[PDB]
Amino acid sequence: GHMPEEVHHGEEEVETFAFQAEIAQLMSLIINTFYSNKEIFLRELISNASDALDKIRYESLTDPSKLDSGKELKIDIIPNPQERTLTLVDTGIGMTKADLINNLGTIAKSGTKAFMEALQAGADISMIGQFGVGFYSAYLVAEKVVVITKHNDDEQYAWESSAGGSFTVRADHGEPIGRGTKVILHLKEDQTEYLEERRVKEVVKKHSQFIGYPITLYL
Ligand SMILES: CC(C)c1cc(C(=O)N2Cc3ccccc3C2)c(O)c(CO)c1O
Secondary structure (H helix, E strand, C coil): CCCCCCCCCCCCCCCECCHHHHHHHHHHHHHHHHCCCCHHHHHHHHHHHHHHHHHHHHHHHHHHHHHHCCCCCCCCEEEEEECCCCEECCCCCCHHHHHHHHHHHHHHHHHHHHHHCCCCCCCCCCHHHCCCCCHHHHHHHHEEEEEEEECCCCCEEEECCCCCCCCEECCCCCCCCCEEEEEEEEEEEHHHHCCCCCHHHHHHHCCCCCCCCCEEEEC
């Protein structure tokens, strides 16, 4: 019948960080400018998943136990019309917390910087992947992006950013993906075409027709 009052927790559960300025500049650039072919975002995500799937499979031959979390190497695409989300799940190698904060918030600095310099000298947005930072093209279509990831050597973590100059990371006790990465795009009001059946088939067939892993569409 008492009333305790927990004045201190084990660890801070929600950490907030600022992107390196160059990453923020590119993100502000992406989320605001016009691009005629915004469908390429899905190509960049599928491209990242192929790489994550490749990396766990390379390690799969030297150590067969690294598929403890799942033996199927696949990509799943789930539009959710009533939540305005599109999610891509892969069972690739995933990311540790250290990698997640570092890769998305910090060491992307060089690629984003070189890419912006490239843009002013006449490159276009579709070259973003040749600068290793294709992930940020998600903001062509999303007002908010969430990344859930699970690496064999770490726990599951959730990353989030609405492109306001900062991102958050927290331990995700939500649904366990056993290994890999889940990207959740909260789409802008005008990009709801990517919640429809035909259009998503159209984009995968147009851009990722030669991926060496199965892509499954869930409606
Ligand atoms: C958020 C964005 C950067 C991203 C990361 C991963 C991901 O964990 N990896 C892991 C890994 C290991 C070696 C090369 C490439 C990669 C990608 C991923 O699988 C996807 C799939 O969409 C993503 O979008």
